[PDB]
């Protein structure tokens, strides 16, 4: 996912 | 003339203040240029302005992300939460932000990289049956003379909600809004001098009513874009 990654 | 001292929430308010504009040009920093892919008529969907466009939504999610991560104990929540508070707030933020752009002398909306629309031109890049409920919002906003400290509280306040649904850990979320509504009451007092504080607030449930909308905005732009919807903004309006 790519708010996981933005978030992580 | 005369306010207690509270000194936490004047920090708090410097940070979200700073964490706001870092993440969010100002209009009158920013070189404004004109296009013209189509700003003589209204059409159904200008292909070239929804490429511009759909960079420049994806570009400013990105930075809503950011503006989330820099406020004070967003973070701490678990990362299914942040998930979820993001994909509720999303649109709410990117409306207030637009319109925060808006000259209403021109009747144009600036978008982050100095890109100035008009109103048929925002028709037809894309907000087609919203571009008016979104100018009306931009005008109803201009009485109000909000500042970027007000604008990223009220945009932390909008992202930060205890009532989303499927928050893991609820209260833990109302707790931090707590100190926003606070610190936005305690700087509309010392600023505006002062009825304001329930009108500003009154305006979230005005950006309820139209993103309620942009939903279904982007179901009907699916079936009129020409590959897929970028990816980052589908993950925040599915
Ligand atoms: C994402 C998105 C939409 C709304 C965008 C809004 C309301 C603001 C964008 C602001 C930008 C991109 C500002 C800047 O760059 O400063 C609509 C409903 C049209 C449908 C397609 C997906």
Known sequence: ?8 | ESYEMTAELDDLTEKIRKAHQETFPSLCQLGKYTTNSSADHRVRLDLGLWDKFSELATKCIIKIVEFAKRLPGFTGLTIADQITLLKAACLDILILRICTRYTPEQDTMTFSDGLTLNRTQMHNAGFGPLTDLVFTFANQLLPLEMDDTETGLLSAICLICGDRQDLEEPTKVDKLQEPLLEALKIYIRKRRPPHMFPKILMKITDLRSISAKGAERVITLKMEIPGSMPPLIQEMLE
Do not use: D
């Not at chain 1, 996912?1 to 992580?8: C, D, G, P, T, Y």
């Open chain 1, 1 to 8: 996912k790519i708010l996981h990654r933005l978030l992580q």
